[PDB]
Structures are given as structure tokens and as C-alpha cells.
Amino acid sequence: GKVKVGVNGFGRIGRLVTRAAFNSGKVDIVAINDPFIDLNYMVYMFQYDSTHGKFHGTVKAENGKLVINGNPITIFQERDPSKIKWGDAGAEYVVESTGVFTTMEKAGAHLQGGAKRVIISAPSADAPMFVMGVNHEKYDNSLKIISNASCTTNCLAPLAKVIHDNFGIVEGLMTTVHAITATQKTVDGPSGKLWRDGRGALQNIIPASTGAAKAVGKVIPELNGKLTGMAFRVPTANVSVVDLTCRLEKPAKYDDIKKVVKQASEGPLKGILGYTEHQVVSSDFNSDTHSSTFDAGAGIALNDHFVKLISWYDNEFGYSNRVVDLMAHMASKE
Amino acid sequence: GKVKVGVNGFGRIGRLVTRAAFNSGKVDIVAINDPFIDLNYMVYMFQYDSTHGKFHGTVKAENGKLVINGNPITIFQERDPSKIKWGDAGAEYVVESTGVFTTMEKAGAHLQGGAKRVIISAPSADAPMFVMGVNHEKYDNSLKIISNASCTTNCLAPLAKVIHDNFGIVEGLMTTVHAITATQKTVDGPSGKLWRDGRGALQNIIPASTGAAKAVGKVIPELNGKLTGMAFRVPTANVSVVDLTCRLEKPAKYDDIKKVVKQASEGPLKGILGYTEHQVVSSDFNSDTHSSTFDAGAGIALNDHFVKLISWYDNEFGYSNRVVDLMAHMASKE
Amino acid sequence: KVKVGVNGFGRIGRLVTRAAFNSGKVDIVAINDPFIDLNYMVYMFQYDSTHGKFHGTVKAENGKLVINGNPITIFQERDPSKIKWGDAGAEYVVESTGVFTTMEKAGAHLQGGAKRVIISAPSADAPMFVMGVNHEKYDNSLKIISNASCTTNCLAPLAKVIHDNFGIVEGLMTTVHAITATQKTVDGPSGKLWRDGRGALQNIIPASTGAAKAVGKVIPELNGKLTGMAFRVPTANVSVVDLTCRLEKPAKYDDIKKVVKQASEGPLKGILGYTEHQVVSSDFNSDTHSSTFDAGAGIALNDHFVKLISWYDNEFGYSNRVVDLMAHMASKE
Amino acid sequence: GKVKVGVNGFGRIGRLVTRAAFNSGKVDIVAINDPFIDLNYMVYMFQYDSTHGKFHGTVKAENGKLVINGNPITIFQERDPSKIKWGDAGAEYVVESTGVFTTMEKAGAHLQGGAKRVIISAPSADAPMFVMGVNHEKYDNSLKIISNASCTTNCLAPLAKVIHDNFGIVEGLMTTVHAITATQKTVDGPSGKLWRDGRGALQNIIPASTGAAKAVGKVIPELNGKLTGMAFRVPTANVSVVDLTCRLEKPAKYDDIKKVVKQASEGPLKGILGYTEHQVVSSDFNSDTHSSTFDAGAGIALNDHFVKLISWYDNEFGYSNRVVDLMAHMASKE
């Protein structure tokens, strides 16, 4: 009944998509490929997690397989994705989570080994991009290689959809205050392509470029060219926040914005877009599976046409659960 | 001789204004009041600083006085500011740095003990407010009680002045990503008036309200009612950044904004407004005495009339040096 | 079963309340805190940066704090002798403010109708207990007792097993401790303990602690044989003890592992844990053990001189031991 | 200040040895090899430092050379250390700072390119190991490949020397509470050989093995087999502390220990072993060039034969200055 899934890469996204699949029970993980992490080490990395705690259940290495809650998973150690025998392991969909095979040409290598569909758990320069709750109904059975966009695009797009649908976004500029990530360094070190990103992550607020706001214009075509932004990386291990400053076409009193976001969080976007009026801080969203949670108290309006809206996101758990939800949606359309 | 100064409070601002006074030599500190920090403890707190390093000169306790670089300072321990005998110590100007006597009525208590003028090192609901380089020439000898605004207003106002003078700010919304402060808590604790501020400072990104952007409209009267904003407190010990999203009246290409800001930093705002095109991060501004440093590479434009401008500020050292600069300017007008 | 009142809604008071609402060992019926009003108590109990959102419901209703539908009377008294514990029905009181730790000061709660007081901190003169080590020495004549500190509850179960099997001739302890509420975010005033005022995020801070000396009161045979100190480091929770000790009988490191594992699997089950996994501090977040021996982290110089490592969630282990001590006291009435 | 030096690796040790060489003027850096960091990036990494601040001087790229304070430095980009043309660049001594060529066989590759002597800025399994102030007089001109031990061994050995010389160490066990390092990860990531070291550095206290205490037994042969220990990595960017628990041969009152350590710090170990009775914390040692600073107030004695001694070390700046001091000592004996 559940679609069988293969995961390429056991980095942060790969492990948390695997954890979301077992926690939610929406899909069945049957294979994992990682050429640099051996089976005994995969048991340790999956079982203990500094951010989300110990896995609830059992994890062990048995007969060359990773056995999670009694379910044996085939382990591959291939550097070339076209050589992974996904079909022999029974993996129908493959989550491409390494971050280095994000074009349709590179991600398509998984079809050579027998996968039926590939979900890139990152932005893609050319694959169709989806955000659950915003454009997932535009998915169709002819699309064999798709992208789930980024964690930041999944936070901004549901909020931008509600605001644009009700008031019309003339233009917007976004800032994301983002938790540290695996690409950063503990102390000042080499990052040849992005010099600021090499600076010590524990000591600094680091400005960074991000295509997340521009990507919202691809998922919501009416907002193409109307949004852009940037990021600041700060020394917190997890949970990030979006700050969208936008100009509205129709007048919107701040209480009217709260009303429409609250009603959207209770209907078609339930579990995707959250809403709170509580005095929350980032740790209150630790392991929260929403893509975006509107913080009513934190935002501020200058006038009825110019406002700053705040939305929280667990950049690890929200996104990993959306990858699983996208695959469950795809399976329902077969 | 140089103006003789009394400092009320030996907290973070009081100690760093004392440090800036002795390092710049622009004024002479002759008295310090603090009811909770005794003399031997003041020596220790002034000598060692986790953020700015050990004091460059000498500091010791001798015959009941705090002696800095051979200069003896009378120490008072009064809870009620109207009882501090400033005149008996020779203090002419008093820096009111406790944060709890910020109205002209409360700060005016220092005139009862013999002070001639009082400088509130914080925003005031009613005192005239100044930002060096923006409106300090509006100071006159009839003003006995004034405010130096906040560190954040001193960062935003010089940048907003240059942008408004050249292109005209129709409206703007600001976010400041701010380093932790003394009012925050190490672990979740009580903060009855501001619940989010009680949450653990090391673990969280904390939204906070700030009147800094609205205060720029008092310092630059043409911007009254055209700016507002909010803050996020993040776990860094020092150095903060302003993110101003504004709508411009005249078209401004991003290279034209860079040209205008660079010219201001090299001329009338030299030492107040800095400019950089380097790949900087927050630690690069540790102990930097500018009020604001425009980060050309970090900002982003959506179009010629809607842009996001970034400016760094050492929230401790920039502001403490501006308090001394303001007092030196006031003394020159006597 | 026993009805309890909590004095103070700081970190220990809230987490003792949270632990009490994880089982039915005790029932919280009253809370006193003159500085935190009812609506703020709802917020502070509901959201916790370290241990996550409370799993149940929490709301203010008719002037009472209602947790999982169970109402609690709220008092706002600065003087402990004035709290009306008896009128609320509180038989035992957890004295968690940290400022009424002598038997004279903690005894003020008996004036309001409480039968027994449990000081959730070390006391200069009250009998001190550590569950699993000397709780069987508790007697119905003791109306005011102390549950020692989180650090003493980590060291004492391990020191008991080591001393029982090999004999501790002498020991020196270091605890690498997570930040606490008494610390400061940036360099600020701490008149009595100057190093503790220095910015907690920026520094490793040495600190004095009577925890190792207190083990000698809990285990009388170790009186005068242990002392130590602490380093506060910038982590929000979870701490570790490092006990360097000289043993009377020779003990190979595998023999130490065997006796600690045996104690964890039987008589000290749920109090002293044992692991051979490649653990780090976050692996003990919200772990309710008092002490978890880290077999891989320790090191022996020889059969008589070793360094033993044990982890403790300084918030959750201790708060659960306060509740366990009260359940034990109730079984003895 | 006359031996010409080549530096292999421009990681944190390589950059800080280069900074110490120009700050002290004791040696002349003439060449640097790093195959992954190009010239323009070396300028940036050397100029800005999150921990120690901006370089005091000038640094530019000119005609393919890195020019520091007007001194041109030849830049090599060789992966194979036997192919670096040290002799052609005039480099007489080579600092091997990559951490991957620490045996005499591997470090000996620099002799193929014309270097006369090699100093491994890390522990070596077989090279002679030195600690300035403890055994540097045992260096002789027949030793072409030597090691300067580790930052932790340089902290413990000067203190252990004074304690052993005066009271005799029967046995000792050390714990070092260590700042984070470049080998750690920002979030839980792969560290196949040392699993605990892959866990998120910002979130955890991490136990780690270290041969530093055992290495003191090689630098002070009388202590061979009498010391061992372990480490805890904690989330601070720099500055570490040693905690030595030792049993003494002769009785020693804690005041006698303070007296002999203070005397050593004022005489033969001046600049190597420091001494303080102040209420210090780790940030008070930021950029401190001592190898070890005894903290009199932090330690504790159980009795006259069993004590815990505490000593601070700036793990970056102390050690980098000792590498330069060792090379200036070797140059003086040529």
C-alpha cells in the first residue's frame, strides 16, 4: 500500500527524511545509498541526533542491512548514481539528497538503476519545483524527476500564497535569520566559493545570498520577479525565521492579515502553515513539522499597504516531512 | 580644562563610556555612582572585559577611590539619584546610564546634586535626542537634559540621512539582528513585562519590539512616521546589524546607492558612517568605533525604488564613543 | 497520592511540577511565587526551551493553574511562614527558591500547615538524601530534609559502587557544568562570586562546589576523602562529572565496567545508567537518570588510579529524584 | 630575526605561525604552500580573523606573491610535499602544519625540495618532541626533523616540570576542557574515525582522547608512564584549560605550590609559564602568548600529597608563538 523509497545520501537531509518516513509511516524506506558512511556508522548517526533526540524505536546492523523497527533496508555504497540497483532493492521513488545531482540530467541517473521517479530534496535549475499546499496539485504522472524546492522556499511560499490571494503582493523583500548548517565551519576555515561562509559559525552573524524568495515566483507564477531577499546565518543549531517586508495592492489592516492567515492554517494548509499569537521563540518550533508558522505578535505594519510578516520554520524537520508528504501525494496519483 | 564627568551606573554602558572617556581623552571622569558594585569589584569589572579585552592602561583601588591611569575617581553608592553629590566631586556633566531614569523628570534628579547637564545614554520619551553626524548641530546651551538615542538609532539614522538626502525615503521597515544584552537570561527565567526576553538567550532567536526606527523620525524630522521596525536577539556576545527595507522616491541603481554612501563615509560622516565592499562578518566589527558601517555586498535591490540596505554596528563600542563625542561637542558650545 | 506544595516557580520548581505531572507518584495542589503571576506561570510551564512544550494542557481558570484538568492553588507570599499550605491541602512542601536552605528557614513552611519540607538544594544542617544511596536512612521523625544537589546525585551513586567494590582511598572531582540561571548573558554584577558574573556565552568559568564533599555526608565512610571544583561552559543543559580516584583494591578498567553495569541493571536501575556508546552531552537531554557512567570516556593510569566519567541531565534527573524522594517518604507514613 | 622559513598549509596553525613570525620579527617567512587556498583568498584569510582580530599591518597580492608588511612571499600550490621547491624560494626551515605529514618519513618529504630542517607543528609518533622552556636545550644540529608537540602538551609540560622538580609527581591524570577546533562539525556530520567528534560542536560537550599527558612523559623522561588523561571539547571559539590531578612524592602545602610556580613564572619560565591569583575566566587569555598560565584560585588540594592544579592556554596564540620561538632557538645554534 505504501510506496517503497530509496534515499541517496545519508547526510542531514537523508537521515531526517528517513526518520520522517518511519515517524509518520506514510512511505516505506527500503534502500539507502552512501559511499562514505558504512553500515555500523549509519546505525549510530541515525540512532542519536543532537537536535531531534534519540530515535524512538530500534536501530541495528544485521546481515549487511540497516534494520529500523524490524524493517531491513538494503545499503549501497556507490559513488556513481547510475550504478545504484534501486529496482533490485524494490525502491520505486528515490530521494536525491546529496545536493550535487540537482539538475534533471544528473538526478535522472537513478532511473538507469530502476527507480520510477526521483524527488530532489533541494532547489533545481530545471526540474519542476513543488511546495506542498501551494502547487502540489500541479504535479502529474508524466513528471518523473521533480524538486521539493528548499526549506526557506517552503516557509515563504505558503505565507506569500495567502497574502497574495487576499491582498495582492505588489513587491516584497525577504530576510531569513537562519540556523547554522553543515556547509559552515566551526572556526575560520576555507570556503573558496563563498568567503563569508568559511568564517567561524559560533562567533559570527554571517550574511549570505539565497534564491529562496526568487524561487517563490516559480512556484507561484503570478509572483515571478516580485520577490527577492537574503539571509543571515546565526549561531543556533536549528530553527530559522523568515521576515517578509511587502507592499500590498489592497489595503490590509494587521487584524485582517491575522484573520486570513488563521483561517488558511485551519483549512487547505492545515499542518503546512501554522498560526500563533503566543509569545514564542525559536526553540518552541524544535521538531515542529509545519513548513511555516505565522507569528502574529512579532510582525509590524507601517500602514495598510506596507507590512513586515514573520514566520518560523524548523529548517530540518518541516522540510524532511514535506519530502515524505510529496511522495505520499505522488503515490496517490499513480 | 576638559569637562569633568560623573557616570551614574557601572553596568555595561557606564563601564564602556568610562573606557571610551579615558581612551579618547576628550573628557575627564571624576565621579561614578553605583549602589550595588563596591570599589574593589569596580576595579575587576573595569580591568577585565570578555568582549573588548583587558583595559590598555592601569586601574586600582586606593584610599576609597577608583584610580584609572593615575586619575582618582570619587565613588558614590546612592540608590536615589537626587542624593548623589556630583558638585562635591566636581562633576559638571552626568551620564545617566542605568536605563531607569530616562524621562527629563527622572534624569533631572542629577541637577539637585549639582550637575550642570545630564546626558541620558538611552532613548527618552521626552528629552531632545541626538545622533552625532545627523543632528548634533541642533544642540544648544539651553538644553540641560538630552539623550544620545540608542545604539540601533545611531546605526540607522546616519544611513537613513544619506539615503533620504539623495533619493528620498517614501517609507521603510527595519529589522535589527541584535547581539545578546544584559537584560536577557542565560536559561528560561522571569521577565514579567516582556515574556519572550525571559527565554534562554543561548538557545533562541527571540523577536523583540524596538522604537529605534520610529526614533529616527525624531532625529530626522522629515522621516517622522515613515519608518518602523522590530528586532531579533540572537546568541552572539556583541556586534549587531540593521536591515533597512525601503521604498525610494527617485530611482536609485544599487551602484548609485554605493557611490553616495561611500562619498558620505569619506567626507561629512567620516568616523560615524563606514563603508565596505569586503566579505565581512560580525566579528570584523569587534571594538569598531563607527556608529554604522554600510555592507555593500550584503544588500540587495528588487528594483530602482525598492531596496534592502545592510549596516553593521558594534552596539557597545560605537555607542559608548558617541556618548563621549556628544559631551565633547556640548562642552565646546559652553 | 501525597499532596504537595511547591515554593518557587523558578527552574527547579517548574521542572519538579513537570515531573510530578508525568506520573501519579505525587499530586501538586499548591504553588507559591510572589514574583510570577498566574497567566505568566501558564506560559513558563507550557513552553520550555530545553525540554520542549509540555505534552498536556495548561490554562488559567478561576484563579487556579490547571494542568491536565487538575487545578492548583496559587499563592503570592514573600514570607514562607505566611503561606497557607494547610488550607490548600499540601502535606509536603518542596522548598525550591534556594534562599531557605537551613532547617530554621525551611521550617517556616510547617507554620502554614505543612507536615514535611523537602529542600531541593544542599543544606548546611538538614539530613541530606540521594535516592539509591541512603534514602533507606529516611525516618518519620525527619520533618525537614534535603535532596542534596544535582551534582551530588550524579557522583554519589557512582562513588557508592566504586567504594563498595574497590574502596576509594581519596578522590578529586571536576564537573563540566551547563550554564545556570545564576549566570549572566554578558559581563555583569555577581558581588559574592566575581567569576560567575562574566559572560556565560563567551567563557569557560571555574567555580567552587561542595558537591564532592557532600558525598562524604551521604556515604559517611567517604567523609573527608573527596573534594572538587567545577567549570561552567556555554551549553544550555546536561553536565558531566569527572572523578579521579585512588582505589584500595586493584581494579582493572574492565572490572570497574562490570560492577557499574551490574549495579545499573539491578539495584540502581533507573538511577545509575551505563553506556559503552559514543555518546555526547545532547544524548542525555531529558534523560531521567541521576548518573550515567560513560565506559568509553574514562581512562585508567594503573589498577589503583583512574578517571571515571558520568553524565547527568542537571535539570531532569534531579527534578525526578525530588518526586521519587517524596513518593518514598509517603510510602513510610 | 634572520632564518628564512617556509610554511606548509595555510590552515589556522599555518596562518597564526605566519602572524606570530611577522608580529615578533624573530624569523622571516619567505614561502607558503597550500594547494586549496589561492593567493587572493590567502590575503583575505590572513587579514581578517574572528578570534584574534584584523592583522596589524598590511597584506596584499602583488605579482603572484603574498606581500605582508612589504615582504614578498612565494606561494606554492602543491599537493605532494616532496615537489615544493623550498630551496629555490630560499626557505631554510619548513613548518609542516597540515596535520597529515607528522611522521619523520612523511615530514622528510620537504628535504627533497631543498629545506634544511622541518618543524612539525603537531605531535609526531617518532620525531624528537620539544616544549620551549622544558627540553629545548636538548635540541642539537643533527636533528633535521623535529616536532613542537601539541598546544595541550605545551600547557601541561611547563607546569608538570615545576611540580615534579619541587615535589615529584608519583602519578597524574589530566582533563583538558578544550575550545572547538577545525576538525569539529557545526551540526551532526561524518567523522568516520572518531564518531563523537562528528557531533554538533555548538550543541555538545564532547569527550575525546588525547595523547597530550602521555607526551609529557617523552618531553620530561622522568615522567614516562606516570601521566595520562582525556579531553572534553566545549562550545567556545578559543582558549582551553588543563586540570591536572596528581599525587606528590614530597608533601606540598597549596601555598608552597603557589610560591614555586610564581617563582618559575618570574624567572626561567618567564613568557612561557604565567601565574595569576586574579578571578580570571577563559576570555581573559584571548591572544595571550603564554604556553600555560597557572590559576592559583581555581585549584584545590585534598591533602599535602593529592592536588588538582589548573592552567589556562590560548590554544592558538601560545602554540603558534612557541613554533616561532623554537625556530629562532634552532637558528641561533646553526
Numbering used by the authors:
A (entry chain C), B (entry chain A), D (entry chain E): 2 to 335
C (entry chain H): 3 to 335
The authors write:
The GAPDH-catalysed forward reaction occurs at an important transition point in glycolysis between the enzymatic steps that consume and generate ATP. HsGAPDH was purified from the supernatant of HEK293F cells treated with the mannosidase inhibitors kifunensine and kept for 4 days at 37°C after transfection with a DNA plasmid for recombinant expression of an endoplasmic reticulum glycoprotein. A fraction of the molecules shows Cys-S-sulfonic acid instead of Cys in the active site. GAPDH allostery is mediated by intra-dimer contacts (the active site of one dimer subunit is in close proximity to residues in the neighbouring subunit).
HsGAPDH structure determined to date (1.52 Å). The crystallisation conditions do not nominally contain redox active ingredients but crystal forms A,B grow at pH 8.5, while forms C,D grow at pH 6.5.
